[model samples]
Target: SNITYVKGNILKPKSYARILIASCNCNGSWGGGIAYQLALRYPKAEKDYVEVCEKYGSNLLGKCILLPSYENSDLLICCLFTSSFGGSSHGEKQSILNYTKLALDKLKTFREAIGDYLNGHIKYPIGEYKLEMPQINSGIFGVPWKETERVLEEFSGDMSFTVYQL
Candidate 1:
């Protein structure tokens, strides 16, 4: 199945091209949950993401920025900004989905132009890259997971996704 429902942490997926990170606008913290988990995976992830947050501010919400973890062989943090800031839920579910869509669209364009190189261990020069994500808008964001799933379904063929439900 292009869509696999695994019962584990997304930080270490079985086979993934990129792991989508549901990020806040800007608040200088990878303080909890998956954000917390990510902090452990990428040593300087919080710093890099926070820097972008400080640099872009709320402008990041309606966009996506890819950040290299610099730790994993091919593990990249697809920082998809959903909310306007941290410790607050001031973003609409639709807006979150919209920004996510555009970010993914850009990835498609980039990979298609030059065959994506992923999985340093395996070293793939393939264009059909697969993306993985967690329950994208749950927890502090307060948006329902079903809503995010529906939006993901809207872009059926954009890219294959494997969503983590744990």
Candidate 2:
């Protein structure tokens, strides 16, 4: 299946497990854009994010991390490390897109591994979580939405996405 576009709030509750994915810089700044929204809504998730960045730094680029929102059991926040810096210092479009691709690739691998590796630690099986997001890199990262859409298309057989627009 391809992406199913749903126009509304991305943070709303759903019938199934919800995994909210967003592009992030390795610098640990959730200071603006959707990351800001996430920080407001799930501060603990943001804390977890900052910790990850503090621990990994720029090595986090081209990787992904899925953090549980302990406040919202049904939700998971996925940070795709697509840039080395956030805000005004974000990377170029092509480089961001490249990292986006790599990060998403890592996401797939992580999702599969979660069943075996994080079986006891994670309460819910991530395999059934619906991948949801806003117009990801287009917002803060400045990549064209269609460019990221093309990248998502490459993983069509791996999983489908639910894209939200506000």
Candidate 3:
């Protein structure tokens, strides 16, 4: 079977002042697919990512991180993760889903970390922009989008952001 892919666009440049908050579900290995694409696109970000993985081991696997994309350029950064890199083994689905939920919950912490560095608190920048989250599913690695949506709705209020299910 062919692998599926999803794409999104962030409206702001973020310039050198913006930070990209990201996480991965497939541990910290950035060898292929979306991870590989990220490494190719942002070598420095990948370096930071790999370094964090090395220092924290698998504990940081599903945790989020704030990556600096530029110093003054408003660039839209991509955050990619998968429930399973290749495929799941037996009962791994439950663990994967658990981790996925954990990651989503961590989004708040991720945003706060970014805000602390940018504006000293958790507040969206003054302006309008869109943030997109893609729909993801693996045979057994199911993420409850409805619940996720409810969680995201708290922040998405009045923002131009949209979510897509692929």
Candidate 4:
């Protein structure tokens, strides 16, 4: 019903969500922070995401890729490419903000398509799905979590983003 923050892992969320959003760099290394955790947790999804990066490169920023988890068919991993290449340590705040915003805006516009197989097999069916993530861009990316939260709050309507903490 609202944006909820909690102190725990975003992956093992007590509140189940069909969609799990991950913060990533276009550089293609899931070796740190939440990216690393996701890499370990969902390697198959990680592989496909890496391939997508290889195909698209830095253009992957400002975009979101949704993939069904190999470990869990019903679960989806939404790789919100929120930075340029070279990893989080080298990320620019504005770039991060722009990319994250782009992904979320895109997600909002996809709600219907997600509901009826209208967009494709990836159809997530609006209300039936839940969305979650960690304090994205705050860890290795070096942006403050509050800044990320402000961006998230802008997209807060007809949606509930359950954000997790470590």
Query: Which scores higher on lDDT, 1 or 4?
Result: 4
Better candidate by TM-score, 1 or 4: 4
Tell me the whole-model lDDT of each prediction, alpha carbons only: 0.63, 0.85, 0.43, 0.74
Give the poorly placed runs of model 1, Cα more than 4 Å off: 13-17, 114-129
lDDT of 1 at 147: 68
TM-score, candidate 3, is 0.53
* Residue-level lDDT tens digits of model 2 in 1-166: 4899988988777877788899999998999988998999889788888988998899988988888866677788888999999988999999999998998998898777712223334566678788998999997788889999999989988878999988
The C-alpha local distance difference test score for the whole of candidate 2 amounts to 0.85
Q: What TM value does model 2 have?
A: 0.92
TM-score of each: 0.78, 0.92, 0.53, 0.85
Which regions of candidate 2 fall more than 4 Å away from where they truly are? 114-121
Tell me the tens digit of each residue's lDDT in model 1 across 1-166: 2356767777654455554556555555677767777877776656778787787777765566655566754566666676675556457767766776665666566556611222333234335335777877677676787766666676666566778887
Rate residue 157 of model 3 by lDDT: 35
lDDT at position 39, candidate 1:
76
Comparing 1 and 3 by TM-score, which wins? 1
Sort the predicted structures by lDDT, highest score first: 2, 4, 1, 3
Which portions of model 3 show Cα errors greater than 4 Å?
1-27, 76-91, 110-130, 136-161, 164-166
lDDT for predicted candidate 1 compared with the true structure: 0.63
Estimate candidate 4's alpha-carbon lDDT, on a 0 to 1 scale.
Answer: 0.74
Please estimate how well model 3 matches the true structure, expressed as its whole-model Cα lDDT.
0.43
